[PDB]
Amino acid sequence: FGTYFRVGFYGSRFGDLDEQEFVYKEPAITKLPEISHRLEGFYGQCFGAEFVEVIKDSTPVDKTKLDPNKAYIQITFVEPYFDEYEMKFNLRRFMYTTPFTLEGRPRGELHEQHRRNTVLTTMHAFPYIKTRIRVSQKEEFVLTPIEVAIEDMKKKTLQLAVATHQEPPDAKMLQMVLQGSVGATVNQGPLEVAQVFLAEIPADPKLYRHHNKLRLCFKEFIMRCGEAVEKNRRLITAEQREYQQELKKNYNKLRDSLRPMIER
Amino acid sequence: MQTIKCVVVGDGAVGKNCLLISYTTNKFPSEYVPTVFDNYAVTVMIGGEPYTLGLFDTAGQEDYDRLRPLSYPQTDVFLVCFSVVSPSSFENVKEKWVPEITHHCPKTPFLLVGTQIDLRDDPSTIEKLAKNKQKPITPETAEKLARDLKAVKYVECSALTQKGLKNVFDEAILAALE
């Protein structure tokens, strides 16, 4: 298919391109570091490397925070965008997300964490005679902290379900998703999510919809964990017996802990 | 073929998680969406062939000394990580990480991965280390260490600048395929 990126240019060194944004269509599976090195390297050849910088963030650029003498490139991965109702060839809309908190930082506690979905509309639609298209419109939508948590859950749940039920089996992928689901040792684990968002039943009715949605994501999530656990029992090597025991122990503890919260 | 199992180890706070989540999501460090979940899957193309990497993120702390190796069986390749601005993390490659993974998986290939290379050539960082009676780890010494400990090779990267980041995972896959 292809990989898309928002690309925008800042500083008077860019002449006509200053402040212009495009969506670039890259081949196959292109990763951030590759398009970034391409663009920074190209402009380094045109301007000289000392004058070229990659903006390392997707937030709207504030020119006053920029060295006026340099040429800045903002590069952001985007995916083709469909409204939730649409979710259930010709591509004019693309979206990137950026994490933010109301306290002014990109990341915060679970209860602080928002996400901004920035929707870009291109001047023309892909597929297109050139490899990039000008951005003609930009809209911003926000997800509140519980909504961010809902997505984190749904997306992990689907990943786990696929890892579990794929044929032929891939035990490595199953174990990776599953250990990271019921066994996290680096990140905090999903229990914390339930404790924050589901522990109290909100008074506000608008908030009740999200509360109920998240509750239902937890049902689906823990269900898929159990399926993951029983499935893995069949895939493991004798060497992995103690590994499996732990995963089962982790699942049971999480299951029992969530139970009171999933009923409410 | 199937998922290549890549276990990622090294001292806490060397930027292991940051580089895994950045690369696998196509995001710079300040824009990555936080998650309460561990590890990362990524599909990468090398010579027009897709390959899938399962990246197992691990907790380096001693509290996990008993639990961590439970993930070691069936590992295809290890990444042994240290920060080029943390001599302690580099010394731990020698005294902790290489011995640990080679004790569990004596035949399994591993790479040495230096991180935070964007800080290494910054004069103020060098000077801050100098005041603490330290110096950063040069590619030459890490390369020598890699050869001395029989790592498949030495690679380095910056999660921030993205420099060498694609290459770290390519070499992991190449090491696992043989």
UniProtKB/Swiss-Prot annotation, chain A:
Q: In which tissues is it expressed?
A: Expressed in T cells. Expressed in bone marrow-derived dendritic cells.
Highest taxon in the source lineage = Eukaryota
- Annotated compartments: Cytoplasm; Cell membrane; Cell projection, Lamellipodium membrane
Gene disruption phenotype: Mice are viable and fertile. The number of CD4(+) and CD8(+) T-cells are reduced by 50 percent in the spleen and peripheral lymph nodes. The number of marginal zone B cells in the spleen are also reduced. In response to an immune challenge, impaired migration of epidermal dendritic cells to the draining lymph nodes resulting in a failure to prime CD4(+) T-cells characterized by a lack of CD4(+) T-cell proliferation in lymph nodes and a lack of antigen-specific IgG antibody production.
Please outline how this chain is modified post-translation.
In response to chemokine CXCL12/SDF-1-alpha stimulation, phosphorylated by PRKCA/PKC-alpha which promotes DOCK8 dissociation from LRCH1.
Q: Which Cys pairs does UniProt list as disulfide-bonded?
A: none
Give the DOCKER domain ranges: 1-264
Homology family: Belongs to the DOCK family.
The entry describes its oligomerization and partners as: Interacts (via DOCKER domain) with GTPase CDC42; the interaction activates CDC42 by exchanging GDP for GTP. The unphosphorylated form interacts (via DOCKER domain) with LRCH1 (via LRR repeats); the interaction prevents the association between DOCK8 and CDC42. Interacts with CCDC88B.
Tell me the function of this protein. Guanine nucleotide exchange factor (GEF) which specifically activates small GTPase CDC42 by exchanging bound GDP for free GTP. During immune responses, required for interstitial dendritic cell (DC) migration by locally activating CDC42 at the leading edge membrane of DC. Required for CD4(+) T-cell migration in response to chemokine stimulation by promoting CDC42 activation at T cell leading edge membrane.
What does the record's free text say on domains? The DOCKER domain is necessary and sufficient for the GEF activity.
- Name of the featured protein: Dedicator of cytokinesis protein 8
- Organism, as annotated: Mus musculus (Mouse)
Q: Which residues of the full protein are shown?
A: 1792 to 2064 of 2100
UniProtKB/Swiss-Prot annotation, chain B:
Q: Where in the cell is it found?
A: Cell membrane; Cytoplasm, Cytoskeleton, Microtubule organizing center, Centrosome; Cytoplasm, Cytoskeleton, Spindle; Midbody
(Microbial infection) O-AMP-tyrosine, modified sites? Y32
Query: Which PROSITE patterns does this chain map to?
Result: RHO
Similarity field = Belongs to the small GTPase superfamily. Rho family. CDC42 subfamily.
GO BP, one annotated term? regulation of filopodium assembly
Q: Which residues carry this modification: Phosphotyrosine?
A: Y64
The residue numbers the entry assigns to motif Effector region are 32-40
CDD domains, sorted: Cdc42
Q: Which organism is it from?
A: Homo sapiens (Human)
Name of the protein in its database record: Cell division control protein 42 homolog
Residues annotated as glycosylated are Y32, T35
Q: Which residues bind GTP?
A: 10-17, 57-61, 115-118
Q: Which UniProt keywords apply?
A: Cell membrane, Cell projection, Cytoplasm, Cytoskeleton, Differentiation, Disease variant, Glycoprotein, GTP-binding, Hydrolase, Intellectual disability, Lipoprotein, Membrane, Methylation, Neurogenesis, Nucleotide-binding, Phosphoprotein, Prenylation
Q: Which Pfam families match?
A: Ras (PF00071)
Which gene underlies this protein? CDC42
Q: According to its record, how does it sit in the membrane?
A: Lipid-anchor
Under Enzyme Commission nomenclature, its number is: 3.6.5.2
Primary location group: membrane
